[model samples]
Target: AASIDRELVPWSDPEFRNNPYPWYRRLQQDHPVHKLEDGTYLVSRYADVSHFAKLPIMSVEPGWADAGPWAVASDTALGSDPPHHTVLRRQTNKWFTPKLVDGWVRTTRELVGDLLDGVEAGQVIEARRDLAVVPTHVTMARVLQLPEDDADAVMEAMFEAMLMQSAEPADGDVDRAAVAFGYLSARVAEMLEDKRVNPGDGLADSLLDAARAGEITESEAIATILVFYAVGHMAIGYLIASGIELFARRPEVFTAFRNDESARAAIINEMVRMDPPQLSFLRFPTEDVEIGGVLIEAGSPIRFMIGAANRDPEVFDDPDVFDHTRPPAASRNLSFGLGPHSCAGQIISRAEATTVFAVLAERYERIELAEEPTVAHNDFARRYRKLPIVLS
Candidate 1:
């Protein structure tokens, strides 16, 4: 059992935010279930995080927290507990399955191919914004049957909306998210109406139909799409950009991803395991529970440190290193989490990442960074702000 004698979570420090892996290693080794000054618990080890994540007593309902910008997220599937969450999730599960997303993978492939086509050989392109972000949104647009112009308009707003999840929100973050949420809710409502009048073979229509069938409420339908509209593309974009960053740094991995079929899956899985998009999420215990030998009182919020758990030495052989050839046990990383609240779009995220990486590998013989990348993150989530790369 490790003990915490010093501050392990310096979330506000810029340098620490840039690369928190070293500190995460310390947490995993020294204090797996370290409690912060705020009375919140930070669960760091793989086994502990995994065990509590699957436990039904660890609730995801948003009522456990003070009213905030994310209060609106409570009605959505990610924000509710069983029965309600199961219904919301079940209404759309079949639509995002691997077999179903195979249809959308073609759109992802085409979008990635087109985006890269604009960049010439040996030219410096912003891989994060141009190569990584756009394809996810475009594919999502097709999935929701949203108009391309509407999708483009909502992209920046979604960025602002994500700031609501920040552990250390800045001034105007909540107000901005409030305004953004209003706009998003209205925009999605409008689109849903249009879909209602003019049905399409899209998920929005399915949701509306679910609403019609009494499977979910109209507000739930709108909130569901709104959540997906914001996070659905953002997380996938992070995965794609992370994979691109990895391949660019190690061209041999890029080479293997291009040549070996098995390596493609391994690379995608390893990239997510190493560089997860959503760093951590909150869970509340309905009753007093002990995790990692630490007693957590009922109704206390626990921030599951996904980044730390993914690299726990007890679970992974080389917890810090990115080895695609690691044993099958490496696949147990908690990047997407486990249990009922696990990411419903995990299959789609993986599929989209595989599409983007494969397309990039096929197009460029040599991939290298044009300059050092810049990343911005809060305590909740992190993403690349810029990744300049030259492909030849």
Candidate 2:
């Protein structure tokens, strides 16, 4: 174990965002669960990380407890536990299942093909803002039966809000999230009202049905849609941008997936394990607990390092190497999280990615990196700020 001071960790240091993994590895080896000055605990060990995911005592509603009155309403399935989450989860799960997602495979393929057609003529194209973000938003607009023209602006607004830097000293994450929720709530409220009168086959319709069936309130429906509105497109965009960047760096792996369509699913898993959108999962411990040989007191905030766990040598051999052929059964990275709180949109994300990559393989004769990629500076999520590529 590398002995290092917990306070010296890179997350608090502005310069650390460019490459925090080295520090993460150091912390994981030395002090797997280190207490920060603010009384928060940072857990990085693979077993401990997985344990926290399955533990019920570790509350998911951290923003509410930490940020107090400023916390946004628990509208989405993500913010709730048990019966409430179960209700919304079951309703939304219908549209995200393998069967339902399989139906959209053709549409996803078509969308990616169209986007690539526009970029193939260019030597340099931004995979993040240009190629990745727009197609996902457009697809989401079609899924929700929304106006195609409005999707781009709406997604951009939500993305900006999510990435907004705090201007006030006292402002917390809940406060920032509140601003995002406000924008999303209004847009989704209008969409829900329209869907109430004339329902469609999208996920929003399921939420509407839940509201009508007395399973969820109007506010909950609005909240649920608002959460999805922000997350649905953004996650897909991240996956595409991240996957393309990985492929650019590792041409051998890219060529393997491109040639063998059957390997698409495995490639997606490898990409996720290599570079997940989220760097850490935040949780508030409801009671005292011991993790990774460190004792954490009740009410202490815990930041589980997902990226660190994904690369832990104990869980995976040659953890740093990106191998698409790695057995899916052996890859236990918590990119979608674990237990009930795991990502509800996992199926949707996977299907969308598989379709996109399959299309890229068939349409483009060659895909190569056009410029040096840049990473987004985020404590919570890992995303590409820029990923320029050439398609031929």
Candidate 3:
């Protein structure tokens, strides 16, 4: 096992921030379950992270620890335990059903088609914004009953909120995130207020319906909607952007993604596995537990490195390479998480991403990166700041 000399993990370093896979390879090879100076455990292997994620002993809530941006959702179901989380999740589950997402795909497809019409071959465009994010954001906006025109602003605000929740935020990140959170809460509150007087066939109305049925409080309904809107596009948008990045770099991938309808899901899944948008997630053990032969004390946080685990060589053959045709045994990546608190919006995310790829495939014969893209990342989230591409 290779030794790590640093007293504290260098998650905040810009070099690591840009690309952490090399260090991930080292950690998974050396420290499958390593404890950090701050008492948090970093679990890097696939099996260890997946095993602990399914156990009830590990919790999603932060009791004494700082909730950061999640402080606003303290009373909400976003970070609660079984009974409470179960009920809230159940209430909102109907909205994200596979059947409903199938219908939503039409909206995403049309949106993507319209966006592509504006860009022509030989013209440079920021694919991340126009091609990737706009469709996902607009669809989420329609589902949440917000103004579709505000997709760009709302997306940026949600990103600000996301930054605060990362492992290490820079100076003034807190204040900026607070403002973003405030703006999001205020906007969603107005929509909820309008929903009270005029209900519609959207998630907002469904949450209000649950509130009326005595299953959850009105405050919980509001907070859930706020969280839903805030997180709705973050992961899926990045997933699409990651796919576009792949398409630009490897035109053959774009060919496979475009021509092979049956391979679309596999292509998107590989993208999520390789370049997960939500890089790491936090969990706290309720009691002392052993993982990968390392004893983790109760109450300290566990940082499950999903990006690292997805590339564990023991589980995946030539793990670092992106192969959409990887066997089913290696298909289980923790991008959407697992067990009880797994992502409720995974269905919609997948639908949105697949549709984006399908539409892009139909429109372009060749896709190439016009310039090198710039990325902004921390330990928890990675997003493209600019992804200029030219399609022919």
Candidate 4:
């Protein structure tokens, strides 16, 4: 792994925000688990990050979102522990079966191709917004049994509402997520009422039934909906866009990807490994815990540096470089994380991003870059603000 200045504050600088891999590289080598004055730990090594993620005492939800605009949706499955998290996750898992999301692959392919075709040859298009965001959000809407026409508008409004979260409520940058959650809550109530009267197969239907049966509360269902739909749309978009950008930038790798169809899944895994979209993940221990040869007190916040762990030279050979030859064990990189707290929809998320290229590999002769892709600076997720490509 390439090392840079260890004194660099990873999150503060805008330049570092656009490209954090170098920062992570230094952290992985110098201080695998660095603690802050506030009793919070920032860990950046493969085995160490995975070790904590596997712990049941590492509570996923620290309840910080409750104080922000996300307050209304704060009681989400993502922010709960043990018995509560288990029940929420178990009930919701029924709707996102491999059968269910896999069924949407055809829809994903059609949407992806339609967008690609809509752009005229030599006309610039952003793979992130024009291509990636569209299909992912549309498939999610379809999965929720929502009107496909409303997907783009609602997603934009809600995303815009979420932007307010980056700023304080009193500063007026945005009221955290107040108006956004209110907007989603209104739409969610409408969808739930419709499902109650005439049930169909999808998340909204499944959640409404669970709520009625007392498996989960109505508010928790809404909160979970916000968490699931919002987060699901983003990761798939970033992953696909990241993969497409990589293919454009590396002709030989893209050629290799096309020649070996069997390696498509591994390509996605490596893309996620090299550049995880969800940059920051937090866990809190239920009891005093030890990891990475360090002792931690109970209820202390721990930052699991996923992007850093994925590039740990101790775990991956030539870790800074992308190599598809890495075995299935390489797929175990800390993108979706590990153990019980891993993403419930990881199987679905991976497929959604992969099927885009799978279908394209069958159709397009090759991929060409319109220009070097630019990274979008996001406080919450790492993504391409603009990805220009040509599928010729």
Q: Report how far off residue 154 is in candidate 1 (Å).
A: 2.9
RMSD of model 1 against the true structure: 2.5
lDDT of 1 by residue, 1-392 (tens): 12233367677678677788888888878878877766788888888888787898988874436546666666777777886788889876878877889898898888777777777767788877776777787777788777655544565676777786766778888888788778877787787778878899788778878888888888888777777766656878878888888888888888888899877888888888998878898888889999878899998889999998888877788667788898776577788878898898888888888887788777777778888888876667777778998888
Model 3 scores worst on lDDT over the 10 consecutive residues at 1-10
lDDT of each: 0.79, 0.71, 0.81, 0.72
Question: Model 2, range 186-263, lDDT digits (tens) per residue?
Answer: 776677678778878776776667787898887677666666665656767888888887777777777888788787
Model 3 residue 138 CA deviation in Å: 1.3
Q: Which stretch of 10 consecutive residues in model 2 shows the poorest summed lDDT? A: 162-171
lDDT of 4: 0.72
List pairs with backbone clashes in candidate 4: 69-177
Q: In the order shown, what is each candidate's alpha-carbon RMSD?
A: 2.5, 3.3, 2.2, 3.6
After superposition, the stretches of candidate 3 with alpha carbons farther than 4 Å from their true spots are: 1-8, 63-65
Runs in model 1 deviating more than 4 A are 1-6, 63-67, 150-153
Q: Give the winner by lDDT: 3 or 4.
A: 3
Q: Which candidate is the best by lDDT?
A: 3
Clashes counted in candidate 3 amount to: 0
Write model 3 residue lDDT over 40-144, tens digit each, in one string.
Answer: 788888988888877988787775257665577665655787867888888767777899888877889998788778775688988788877777877877887
282-329: candidate 4 lDDT, tens digit per residue: 778879988778998998888887888888877788988888889777
C-alpha lDDT of residue 57 in model 2: 82
lDDT of 1: 0.79
Each candidate: how many clashes?
0, 0, 0, 1
Q: What is the lDDT of residue 123 in candidate 3?
A: 86
